[PDB]
Structure formats: C-alpha cells, structure tokens
Amino acid sequence: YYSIIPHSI
Amino acid sequence: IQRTPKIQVYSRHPAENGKSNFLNCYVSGFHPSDIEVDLLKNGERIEKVEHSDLSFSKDWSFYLLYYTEFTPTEKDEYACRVNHVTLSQPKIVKWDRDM
C-alpha cells in the first residue's frame, strides 16, 4: 500500500 | 553526479532458429533517467517494442528492460542502440548468442 509524504523537504 | 549505463542484449529463452523468442535489451546503473533505447533488426529500428516501468536500485541508479517478440534466423543481425548524456555517441551492442 502506497503511503504519502506530508510535506516538502 | 552521472552514471554510464550497462547494456546487455540477450534472449528470454535460449535461441534456436525458427522458434519465436523475445529479444531483450537490459540497461541498468545509469543516471540521470533520460535515455534512448532501440532494438535493431539488420540496423533498422524495431517499432513493436515494449519496456519496463522506470525503476532504480539501492544506489539510486536506474534500470530498464526493453523487449520485443521475434523469431531468430541464421542471418538476421540484431542489436541494441542506446544513447545517454554519458555517451559521446550512441552505443550499438550487437546480439551475441553466447555472450
């Protein structure tokens, strides 16, 4: 299952 | 900052004339991701070619499998042409039934 990053670096 | 691609041209199954096989060109270990890959039949670009989804290894270097259905003969020369920013000119790797 794909999981996202919450914000930019 | 840049990695040169490793090129391998080979068949899915061992090649014997008259039997339909698959011609593969595996390019790996390259960076950046932009790359030209063609399969050649007698120097002529093959149209009906498929390729894998862009992916990469542990060192972040990319790899791609290009493949086409074919039936090898004793006189048909096959090769893979790869161009990349790390290459001063396109590299043509001939298909060898033994290496």
Binding site: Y2, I9 | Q8, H31, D34, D53, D59, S61, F62, L65
Partner: protein
Amino acid sequence: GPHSLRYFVTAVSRPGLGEPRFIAVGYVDDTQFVRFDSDADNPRFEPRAPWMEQEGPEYWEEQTQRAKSDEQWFRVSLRTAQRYYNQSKGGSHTFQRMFGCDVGSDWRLLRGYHQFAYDGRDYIALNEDLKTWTAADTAALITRRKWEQAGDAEYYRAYLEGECVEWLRRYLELGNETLLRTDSPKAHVTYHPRSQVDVTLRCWALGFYPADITLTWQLNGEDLTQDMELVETRPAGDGTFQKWAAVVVPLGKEQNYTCHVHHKGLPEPLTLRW
C-alpha cells in the same frame, strides 16, 4: 521465509518542457505489481501483476489519490531543493524516494525504509530505529530539523509497522501461487576461444528466483575476482533472472577452475567446471 514490500518513486524536473515527470512502482520481493506514470494516457495506480487485477475500484481510487498527492509534494520538493542548492531554474534535476518494509518468516517487521535522494545521491534517510534521520549534507540538515520538529518519523513508523506489514501479507496471499516460489539457478560453464595462449570461461546462471545470487571463480580452491568479469543480474522477462561471470585462462588448465553458485534454492551450493 522473509519478504519485502518496496516502492520506488521518481520525479524529474523538466523546465521549458512542462510539469515534472512523476513515476511510482511497487514491488513484492523481486516482482513488480503496481505502477503510476504521469506520462501515461490515463495516469492512475494500475496493476502490473495478474493477481492484482482482483482488487476493486476502492483500492485503485484511493491509491491514485495518494500518488497524486505525492506528485504535488515532489514538485515542491524539487523546487525547494533548487532553492536549497542555489541552482539554476532552467536545469533538470531528480528527486527519488524509496520506502517499504521487510518482514521475517514470523510475519513481523524486520526493517522499515523511508529514504530520499537528490540527483542520484543520498539526501535524507529514516534510520533503522524509525525515530532518527541521517542527513547527507547541510541542506538535508535543514530538512532533517524540519521533519524532526514536524514529528514525521512517528507518522512513517505508524505506516511501516501497521499498514505496510498488513498489506504485504495480503499481497503474499493474492499471489501465493507465484510469489512464494523459489527457482534454483540452472548453471553451466561455456568455452570461448580467445588468443593462442588463453581462453575465456563464462559461467552461466539461468532461470533463478529471487534475483539474489552469488557467482565466483576460484583457481585451485583459492579465489579469483580482480581479473573476473561480472555482469549485473538481469531479468529474463518471464519472472526469472540471469547472470554470468567470465575469466581469462591459459590453454590446457581449464579444469583447475571452479565456478561456485550460491542461491536460496540451492541447499548445497554449486561447483561447476567446463
């Protein structure tokens, strides 16, 4: 036996051509099963293995949305990285992400991954504790501090321990017919004339799965590599893999050379000669 779920995500800026390319691919062990491609006719999370065509719209709809979210944030990251490094807005750069989990034979988390790269070099990586970060440079130090303060590690860890492991078990059930297999390599040594002093011995390994394999040449029980040519493991195209290693050896003494093959499917390792 152990198993892994892995995603490999790539974003490539291309100013003057348009929006950044964005592609994600998922793997179970050495088997791809999904993909998202921004350059496709209809960009969406779609199956890349026959045993995934089972899952309904609620899977692909939710997966497509998550991918498009990351696509937007990968765009920002690319822009932010360009700012961090004071690079030209006109140049093309790459931003990569790999994540997923390793589970043991007992169906529990063995290792979780969440690491990032800029232009093919390490940027920041979630450590093995899933609490701390390793930054590759001072730019990534800025990122690390922001992600430390934001509490990102606990958020990723929550995925790695729960969602990642559970869905991996689901995939291993969906593709139980093919994923749980272990094809031992069929190996042999080929003779190829070289000079009039020496000859080339190419040790082959064919049709093995998984892709992890060990090929070495040893002369008279010792070991040889510094002269040996070793190509990287390649996909046959049928779900199996190939690899070879060659050595240049003088005429007549070919049988003093042994090729040695180590692999999961080989209880006893293989020792081969021409």
